[PDB]
Amino acid sequence: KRLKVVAAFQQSGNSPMGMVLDAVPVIPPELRPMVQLDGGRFATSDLNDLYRRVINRNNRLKRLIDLGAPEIIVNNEKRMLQESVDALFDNGRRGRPVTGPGNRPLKSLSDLLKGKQGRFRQNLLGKVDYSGRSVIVVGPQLKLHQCGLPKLMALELFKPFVMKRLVDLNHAQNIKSAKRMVERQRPQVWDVLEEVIAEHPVLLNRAPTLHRLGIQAFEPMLVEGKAIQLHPLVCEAFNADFDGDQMAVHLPLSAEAQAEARILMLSSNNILSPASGRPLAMPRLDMVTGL
Amino acid sequence: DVNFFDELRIGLATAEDIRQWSYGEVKKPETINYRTLKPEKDGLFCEKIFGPTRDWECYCGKYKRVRFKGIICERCGVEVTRAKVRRERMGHIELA
Amino acid sequence: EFIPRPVKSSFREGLTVLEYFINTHGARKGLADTALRTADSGYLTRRLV
Amino acid sequence: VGSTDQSGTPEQSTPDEVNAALDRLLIADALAQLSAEHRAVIQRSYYRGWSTAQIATDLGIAEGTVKSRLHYAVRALRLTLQELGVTR
Amino acid sequence: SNNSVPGAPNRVSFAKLREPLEVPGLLDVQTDSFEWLIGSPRWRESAAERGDVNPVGGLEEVLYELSPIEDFSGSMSLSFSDPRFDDVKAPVDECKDKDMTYAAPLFVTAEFINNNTGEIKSQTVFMGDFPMMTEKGTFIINGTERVVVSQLVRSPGVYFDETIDKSTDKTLHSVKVIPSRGAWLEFDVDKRDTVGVRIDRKRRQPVTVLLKALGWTSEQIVERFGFSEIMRSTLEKDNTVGTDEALLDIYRKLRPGEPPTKESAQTLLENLFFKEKRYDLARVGRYKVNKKLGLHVGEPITSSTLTEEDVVATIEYLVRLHEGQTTMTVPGGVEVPVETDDIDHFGNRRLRTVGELIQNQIRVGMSRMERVVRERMTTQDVEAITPQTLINIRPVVAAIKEFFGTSQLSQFMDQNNPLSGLTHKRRLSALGPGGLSRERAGLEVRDVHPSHYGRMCPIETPEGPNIGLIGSLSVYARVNPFGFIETPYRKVVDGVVSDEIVYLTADEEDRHVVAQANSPIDADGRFVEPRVLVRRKAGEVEYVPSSEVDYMDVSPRQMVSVATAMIPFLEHDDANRALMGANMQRQAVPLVRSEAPLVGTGMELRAAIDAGDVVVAEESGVIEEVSADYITVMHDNGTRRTYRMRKFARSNHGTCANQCPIVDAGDRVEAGQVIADGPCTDDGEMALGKNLLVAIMPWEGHNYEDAIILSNRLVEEDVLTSIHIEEHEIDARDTKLGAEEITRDIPNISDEVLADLDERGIVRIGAEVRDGDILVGKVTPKGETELTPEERLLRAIFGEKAREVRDTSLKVPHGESGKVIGIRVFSREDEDELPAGVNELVRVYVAQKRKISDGDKLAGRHGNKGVIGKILPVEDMPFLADGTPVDIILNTHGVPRRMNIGQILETHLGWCAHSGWKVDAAKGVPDWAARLPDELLEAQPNAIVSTPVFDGAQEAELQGLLSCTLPNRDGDVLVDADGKAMLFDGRSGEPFPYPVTVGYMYIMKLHHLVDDKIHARSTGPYSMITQQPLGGKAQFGGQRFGEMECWAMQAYGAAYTLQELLTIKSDDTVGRVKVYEAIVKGENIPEPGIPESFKVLLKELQSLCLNVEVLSSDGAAIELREGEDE
Amino acid sequence: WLSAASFQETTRVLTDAAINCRSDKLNGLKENVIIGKLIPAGTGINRYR
RNA sequence: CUCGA
DNA sequence: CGTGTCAGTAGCTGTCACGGATGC
DNA sequence: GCATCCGTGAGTCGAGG
Ligand SMILES: [Zn+2]
């Protein structure tokens, strides 16, 4: 295992001297911002405190070096500068973490990347516009490829598409006033909205997304009310009862995304379970009793 | 800025690399002024180092218009571009 | 382990005070461990992913 | 008082550029219906922010020529916008 | 009859067991705790008859423990005495309106005692504005009602544990000495048969190092611990010997870095464990030690400190337990068993309430001031010193402010319905300071413990991540001054039930055996069977002779909570759905009009009155004048009291708290009677829902798996209509370029949008406002140097000069709509104290009238929940023989799985209540109605009945009532003796082939409405740092396509949909704008760019001294619109 | 190393990544998701794209 | 903090 | 600015399985 | 050469504070 570390510095051509720092970089301010509070006071990022304590102790060391202070003060100051940079990069790694006000450990630069709240899992592996969510309600009359979304959800979801059509049919003079019409819900938009969502598939999602059938594509149907109407046969895939569940809606924009929803993700093209091959969209509760 | 580039290389940052990135040293420990909201010079938010708070607005207030695009102000040392640079310009602290 | 005394009554008949009390022991821990068992399930799932 | 990492502090947000993008699209349409002279003068006064004498020096024209071209080109754009229903 | 004490409606109970003890004050936990803290006359008289001699309140106890304050010499002294309160600063409702704190000024008497001059100056010193508790058991911090929650903490004392080692597989033992305050001390026996001790988390020293430091010779140690070989191996393996040697060994491990003096360690080893300054076992902590060790068990509790004798007896208790011993007597002490403790047992698990939690924060605030006192003494002169100069009340008032302002125990009050508030004040929370962390709570702290019987409810607890950590206090339970929970029992003398009732603690209950409440008892008191179901220690249930029963339960419902005791036929519902049934009753929404349930339990009356959301008459009298605004009562003596009605007030959760008078003019009303009832109340009883005609049948798939079908009559007749009120707020501040002003003049806005505003820019009272409408017109000045090039050109091509202000008006959020009912304006110009930098403040109250909609969540009392899937017209509904259509259709499939038959039994009894019954009196009383009271043999239609928990109606009597249901107005009986009835299909006309169960069920409207839960977003705000869309509906954010959702796209192979979601639709700064343009232009969707979040990741790896670079196919590094200089 | 640093033990992976000076060929499902490229699977492979 | 699936 | 008699955290352990570098 | 101890991991989404 020692060779594993030594051979890495030998072949690569980078010096191990990089493990000892002569200068520490400062992350740009917008990534550690200081915001003003509605009470007149200020709230800042913890990284500013860590950088500030490194600056305070490094400037004090420069004074001791200039003053020729006893080696006991200079050495005991250099130790503190070591612990400050250790807290800036990974507070809490060695010993007890630098606590802020209220015995709260300050976040370090490495804390921006760790765990579920880190940069990778929170802002890279998962992130979206053109989406919504509401309560789901059973719709027996719907076909397997159909779903019912509220009119008020579809208007906001298809807002730019509706603005485009409001200005084509000369319901609105310019695209600017076409936006004010959708925001004010002028009665012309409900006739225009029906033309827009025509054969434009949408995606329905219920968390937790355990398997790939946790997200399926449907043909939207403008329905009154404020609840999403879901087909009774896709309830098994979503593991979705109707005791207060909510589902998310995502609108594919590009031609490729709509084609992926129309062909790959359509609920009618996914009747069988990919895990076992046995059907899922089949009579399950009232339907099996009726038959 | 196309989206096809093959490799993503990572390595140890030389102390000389830290200086090659840095647009200036953060000397003072102060942050901003609590009346004018203007950041103090050489502080953790110094506009001479990181960039202007507002677009095309310098610290001392001599250059506030777009016509002076790219001028390094002589009295406060702040460049005049958009505040987008305050998301990418690195600083550094030179250790004793 | 199972209690040496069973719940003889049925929910149609109506449990006694002590029968109901001893029933809640298994009912609550049945819901309690379900939150932990789903955490280890989802953790194993993302390792397999 | 406060730490952004600490809970209870609202995160900073920036509005969307929809209103700005729509105005930019309508200004780009009204700009195309202008003469190459007027278009090359409003794009040097409002898009580049130069002075009146700076545009006069670049285009090799008189001082009042830039003042007059700007004076009409603004009204020409107001004609095209009011014809398309742009709100005053 | 049920509850014939205040003058309530006559609800007839199916009671076979008499109630020996009536329900206590449900608010006593919050009330009695605070009365002791401030030493109210009610607490003092309560402690007077309790037998106490010279009792001391919580504030007096802190002043006596603090007094006196002396320096090192003793030349200066300060003392405090006589705490008293002046009248409250402002009334309760004024604090809610002006966003201040309900408090009363606290006065004390302080004096300076000077030994070197022989003269004392005494005076009155104001300590601080002390937050006061309202009559409803709540505090008001900055205009918001809060509830201080009682905390379950580990009781102080000495505790022993039997742990099993990991590597050697031998049984180990450990001891913990947990004080009420100070340093901790834990002894243990490791796997090497040696004894050690960890002192305040520090390093583990050999147990003899502590003995040698206290002054014990090495010979006396062998004399005391000689019977065990594991202690002989401890003194032998010991490193250092000597009284002045191990004392310095402790010093260098406890306070490192300091010169070790024989007297600097002699000082702290006495102060940290034996001086009352830095160590203290409470009166309960001392008593718990004197019982666990069996010493001083007869001496009056005077020692408030740990002693050296206790440390020795503790080590003696440990060493015997390790080698199998089961009994021990301390030298000079009573005999006591040797065992390990539960720490979950309610005799070792203590509950500290409001007064103690506040007292501890006062004690810490006093100690911070005491240090200021000692410092101000040695600085100022010793002749101009007064109590006013030594006292700095800043850390004291800031200590109580820190508590009420920020504490897991100071909680924003639940105010959905009166029951939710009552339950909140009776909560028992294990979380918080001194308790435990949520990450530090295994499956053992959360489950039901046999000592919770009659103390903490085993049903009412959340089902989320706080399951088991939050419980509700049982009905008859109470808290003793020690902190444990007592529950009443009927003392059985010699197999005879007596009306003498005594409260027993957890361990006191284990020292006896108690009989179940529903025991067959003779009219004299003797048990019918020799063997009866009896509960014994360690959770044992078995039969036992009648001459063995020591006590028995007061009431059947003794073990359940108030909300749980409100579930009829609870004994027929499994614990899972019963938990949801009680938890969802607290989620009921107050309706416009309230109906008391036909099938009740009797608890609804006392639950409503003790909640405090009704209006009860304090003194008997007649009604002089009654209005919708107030009620005036003319007393017998001649005085008048007038009660003001709370009308259309916004609760903490947006519900409508609205009180209505019940009595009329000139009505004689007794004391303690309900003269006006508020939300979720009908004639003084909790009315959490409505009585709906239910049919149990599948109906065309609209009620499929837990969906609900409703009659449109409930919409037409406002049966499930509720009022909701939202609060909107905006302020006008001082900015860098001027000041924001609230004005009707808004740039580039027509006179039509501003038509609903008054001359100030505020919306007028009564105006109906949709989403997007202006509520408060505010403009903020924007600088010229902040203008877009297009915006400056757009300003030039419109000639509108002097518009240096932009629009920042308060608009109505998406999904909001209602009538403006109230406006409140606060102006710095008009003496109103606003925060510094604010010139004006406006609050607008909007009320919406919400009818029941498709998707709103309804539920019953038995955990039967579901959303509304379809609201058919009244003619489509399956209707009975006489044409009356049903109101609600419930799917049958979701009934026998959940094991909640109570809803079926409620439906049967509910119908019998609606129709009435008449038992055949001729030829005697039938054999099924022999146990029923005579008041139940006849019932008029729409009668109210009570089915108490674990008592009440039996299925034999219920089956018999269905057989003699009263006929309708035509004389026809609609439902059969089975309980089913013949229904007609309203859509076709053909009658349904088979009879269907039909009756009346109590349905509640839960606070989960689609009007709030619907949300959608095209574009909107983005987080400044990550450039991703915001979160939450209130911020107009987008949905999160999480990690698991990306796996689904990849599983489908939907590469383009996945890339589109993570780029242009999220955090592509230039891609999202060009997509919006491409849509309004009709062009195609452009190509996705690089996510801004990935740019931030690289810039953060750089700040960690990592050189990250993106290389092209050739190998050259490519930058991202940026460079690097030195 | 980019697919590993986003899974578990972020600092333990980034340390060894900078010492060994590893270069990541951005050709994987997890990597393309982070940088915004089309995943090399389904409709993203060069055969169908 | 508390709650919903 | 000058500083000068005692002058000394809160809080807390009520998580655990598991693997391998660290250490007597 | 091995017992100790350090560091790692521990469901997803949503509402209001
Ligand atoms: Zn300047």
PDB file of C-alpha atoms in Angstrom, chain B residues 14-91:
ATOM      1  CA  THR B  14       0.464  23.738  -7.096  1.00  0.00           C
ATOM      2  CA  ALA B  15       0.812  26.803  -4.888  1.00  0.00           C
ATOM      3  CA  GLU B  16       1.913  28.507  -8.107  1.00  0.00           C
ATOM      4  CA  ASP B  17      -1.345  27.392  -9.743  1.00  0.00           C
ATOM      5  CA  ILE B  18      -3.263  29.051  -6.897  1.00  0.00           C
ATOM      6  CA  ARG B  19      -1.490  32.306  -7.759  1.00  0.00           C
ATOM      7  CA  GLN B  20      -2.069  31.778 -11.490  1.00  0.00           C
ATOM      8  CA  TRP B  21      -5.818  31.615 -10.799  1.00  0.00           C
ATOM      9  CA  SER B  22      -6.024  34.462  -8.295  1.00  0.00           C
ATOM     10  CA  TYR B  23      -6.903  37.982  -9.450  1.00  0.00           C
ATOM     11  CA  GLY B  24      -5.378  39.362  -6.236  1.00  0.00           C
ATOM     12  CA  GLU B  25      -4.619  38.609  -2.605  1.00  0.00           C
ATOM     13  CA  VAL B  26      -7.266  38.982   0.104  1.00  0.00           C
ATOM     14  CA  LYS B  27      -5.312  40.989   2.680  1.00  0.00           C
ATOM     15  CA  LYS B  28      -7.853  42.554   5.038  1.00  0.00           C
ATOM     16  CA  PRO B  29     -10.402  40.391   6.900  1.00  0.00           C
ATOM     17  CA  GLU B  30     -13.278  42.854   6.466  1.00  0.00           C
ATOM     18  CA  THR B  31     -16.270  42.061   4.264  1.00  0.00           C
ATOM     19  CA  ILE B  32     -18.289  45.138   3.257  1.00  0.00           C
ATOM     20  CA  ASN B  33     -19.376  48.477   4.677  1.00  0.00           C
ATOM     21  CA  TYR B  34     -22.625  48.276   6.630  1.00  0.00           C
ATOM     22  CA  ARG B  35     -23.971  51.677   5.520  1.00  0.00           C
ATOM     23  CA  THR B  36     -23.057  52.003   1.826  1.00  0.00           C
ATOM     24  CA  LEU B  37     -23.116  48.218   1.160  1.00  0.00           C
ATOM     25  CA  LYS B  38     -19.873  48.852  -0.749  1.00  0.00           C
ATOM     26  CA  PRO B  39     -17.272  46.114  -0.168  1.00  0.00           C
ATOM     27  CA  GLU B  40     -14.065  47.212   1.525  1.00  0.00           C
ATOM     28  CA  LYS B  41     -10.873  47.194  -0.525  1.00  0.00           C
ATOM     29  CA  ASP B  42      -8.715  44.046  -0.313  1.00  0.00           C
ATOM     30  CA  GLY B  43     -11.461  42.341   1.716  1.00  0.00           C
ATOM     31  CA  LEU B  44     -13.298  39.089   1.108  1.00  0.00           C
ATOM     32  CA  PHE B  45     -15.568  40.906  -1.386  1.00  0.00           C
ATOM     33  CA  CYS B  46     -13.059  43.338  -2.922  1.00  0.00           C
ATOM     34  CA  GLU B  47     -14.231  44.581  -6.314  1.00  0.00           C
ATOM     35  CA  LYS B  48     -10.634  45.105  -7.459  1.00  0.00           C
ATOM     36  CA  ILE B  49     -10.083  41.360  -6.961  1.00  0.00           C
ATOM     37  CA  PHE B  50     -13.343  39.555  -7.692  1.00  0.00           C
ATOM     38  CA  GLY B  51     -15.353  42.023  -9.775  1.00  0.00           C
ATOM     39  CA  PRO B  52     -17.905  44.832  -9.760  1.00  0.00           C
ATOM     40  CA  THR B  53     -21.024  44.557  -7.620  1.00  0.00           C
ATOM     41  CA  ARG B  54     -23.147  46.061 -10.409  1.00  0.00           C
ATOM     42  CA  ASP B  55     -22.628  45.831 -14.156  1.00  0.00           C
ATOM     43  CA  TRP B  56     -20.153  48.393 -15.555  1.00  0.00           C
ATOM     44  CA  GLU B  57     -20.078  50.185 -12.168  1.00  0.00           C
ATOM     45  CA  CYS B  58     -16.711  50.631 -10.459  1.00  0.00           C
ATOM     46  CA  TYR B  59     -16.035  51.141  -6.753  1.00  0.00           C
ATOM     47  CA  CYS B  60     -15.020  54.813  -6.670  1.00  0.00           C
ATOM     48  CA  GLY B  61     -17.918  55.722  -8.979  1.00  0.00           C
ATOM     49  CA  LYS B  62     -15.889  57.292 -11.790  1.00  0.00           C
ATOM     50  CA  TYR B  63     -16.969  54.799 -14.484  1.00  0.00           C
ATOM     51  CA  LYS B  64     -20.692  54.001 -14.382  1.00  0.00           C
ATOM     52  CA  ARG B  65     -21.512  53.751 -18.110  1.00  0.00           C
ATOM     53  CA  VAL B  66     -21.192  51.012 -20.723  1.00  0.00           C
ATOM     54  CA  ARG B  67     -19.036  53.042 -23.134  1.00  0.00           C
ATOM     55  CA  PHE B  68     -15.988  52.446 -20.897  1.00  0.00           C
ATOM     56  CA  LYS B  69     -16.008  48.694 -21.496  1.00  0.00           C
ATOM     57  CA  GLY B  70     -12.829  46.993 -20.293  1.00  0.00           C
ATOM     58  CA  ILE B  71     -11.130  49.952 -18.577  1.00  0.00           C
ATOM     59  CA  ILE B  72      -9.044  49.212 -15.485  1.00  0.00           C
ATOM     60  CA  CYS B  73      -9.897  52.138 -13.211  1.00  0.00           C
ATOM     61  CA  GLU B  74      -6.795  53.880 -11.879  1.00  0.00           C
ATOM     62  CA  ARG B  75      -8.229  55.181  -8.590  1.00  0.00           C
ATOM     63  CA  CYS B  76      -9.872  51.977  -7.307  1.00  0.00           C
ATOM     64  CA  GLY B  77      -8.398  49.267  -9.555  1.00  0.00           C
ATOM     65  CA  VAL B  78     -11.737  47.671 -10.472  1.00  0.00           C
ATOM     66  CA  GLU B  79     -12.400  46.321 -13.949  1.00  0.00           C
ATOM     67  CA  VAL B  80     -15.682  47.178 -15.665  1.00  0.00           C
ATOM     68  CA  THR B  81     -17.532  44.094 -16.889  1.00  0.00           C
ATOM     69  CA  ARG B  82     -20.741  42.419 -15.758  1.00  0.00           C
ATOM     70  CA  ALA B  83     -21.160  41.060 -12.238  1.00  0.00           C
ATOM     71  CA  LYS B  84     -21.110  37.580 -13.814  1.00  0.00           C
ATOM     72  CA  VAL B  85     -17.343  37.513 -13.186  1.00  0.00           C
ATOM     73  CA  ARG B  86     -17.958  37.459  -9.416  1.00  0.00           C
ATOM     74  CA  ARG B  87     -19.003  33.816  -9.948  1.00  0.00           C
ATOM     75  CA  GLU B  88     -15.691  32.698 -11.485  1.00  0.00           C
ATOM     76  CA  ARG B  89     -12.798  34.992 -10.463  1.00  0.00           C
ATOM     77  CA  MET B  90     -10.663  33.299  -7.812  1.00  0.00           C
ATOM     78  CA  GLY B  91      -8.817  34.940  -4.948  1.00  0.00           C
TER      79      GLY B  91
END
